[PDB]
Chains A and B, each alone.
Chain A
């Protein structure tokens, strides 16, 4: 899920290493 309008997700970004 993505944080488009709000802050509902535990994390809104995706980590992709360095």
Chain B
């Protein structure tokens, strides 16, 4: 029973209720004028001001307008400025302000709102959980870690804080440490804990430590609608796209691209070798904590469908070749990159983020022994000048145990069943 009416607002409760009804019934433009009149007669009224903000919120939804939402965001702020705001209404208004600030990508501003909310309600642990999510969204795992520690100091049983703390630990490569927190947080069943991200990383942490229990959690995640399957564990998915670990060129439909990669493979190889020899610093160590051991670096020509101009200066013929194929240069959920691994390298079993791409590998320098890739239950080898294709949303793994280096060219393509408008509008990954 949220108490939103301060003493004066109770004296005008009738007019407020009539205005909110118009907003309930959907007469948006009618309610913005009803609440404008209430804001006129009663300029200090928090409930009138909240009505104006909610209507501005709904108007941003119909019109799909960032500018009108900015105005709503300010009005939600104005509610909190007025005298004598009831606590429930104050909390409702600033929470919704932060949420819509996150909508707009004003992640720094959302953070100030959340920090104020925690300052205003230091006993609300859920507001602290929300604050930590704000830190997580701007990539500040350090402050997010501290926040969930503080939650757990006061409410050790809070499941939301548990999983988020585990997520952070796991992201920090505190693999063993993260398992109990992720596991207990999911088992709590608290709101916000039934999230694919936590099934994803609990199972992966279990795998890395050798806990055969890892797949129990993948099944539960599949059963709760988060994973397409136990083997295919991507989280940014389009449902219905055909799903198989290995593809032939013909199945993908990108027959002309495969032809061109294989016909011109040595120019791609030679430019890659030239960068190894003369510009080796362009190869960057893979830094997503996917390397179990060894030496593994990548030289990226395209990411998120954008050409890296300086990188293409080091592979000019290759970039010229690839420009003819928007199915890969426009794959805003994939990359185009050389990859090199040296002997004694092992890539952890892992999954890519999206089922919306397929990953091509063109072999460039493949030692005759020592090198292999598993996708799902099938392990294959590369050939120099030949293309392999797999769906890297399926769990896959690579070993490099040869006596010399391994070099391939990676070309991501849109999943062939994605329509042109899907390819144009899916957010970049």
Partner of A16, one of B65, B105, B303: B105
Instruction: Decide: A10 near B197, CB < 8 A? Known: A5-B286, A15-B102, A15-B103.
Output: yes
Q: Give A6 to B105 CA distance when docked, in angstroms.
A: 23
Bound Cα distance from A1 to B57, whole angstroms: 31
Tell me how far the C-beta of B229 lies from the nearest C-beta in chain A, rounded to whole angstroms: 15
- In chain B, what residue has the closest Cβ to A4? B335
Segment 1-18 of A: residues with Cβ below 8 Å from B = 1-18
Interface presence of B205 (CB below 8 A): no
* B427: A residues at CB distance < 8 A: 13-14
Q: Please report the C-alpha to C-alpha distance between residue A8 and residue B51 in the assembled complex, in whole angstroms.
A: 40
Assess the B290–A5 pair: CB atoms within 8 A: yes
For chain B, what secondary structure do more than half of its interface residues adopt (helix, strand, loop), or is it mixed?
loop
B64 and A6 within 8 A (CB): no
Give which listed residue, B64, B234, B303, B352, contacts A2 with CB less than 8 A.
B303
Assess the A1–B139 pair: CB atoms within 8 A. Answer: yes
**Centre residue among B167, B352, B392 by max chain A CB count within 10 A:** B352
Closest chain B CB from A6 CB (angstroms): 4
Q: How far is the CA of A10 from the CA of B354 in the complex (A)?
A: 14
**Chain B 264-306 interface 0/1 with A at a Cβ cutoff of 8 Å (1 = within):** 0000000000000000000000101110000000000001100
Query: What 6 pairs across the A-B complex have the smallest Cβ distances?
Result: A17-B66, A3-B353, A10-B136, A13-B427, A18-B64, A6-B288
The 20 listed contacts between A and B (C-beta, < 8 Å) are A1-B139, A3-B236, A3-B288, A4-B303, A6-B350, A7-B353, A8-B171, A8-B288, A9-B139, A10-B137, A10-B197, A12-B235, A13-B427, A13-B428, A15-B102, A16-B104, A16-B105, A17-B104, A18-B66, A18-B69
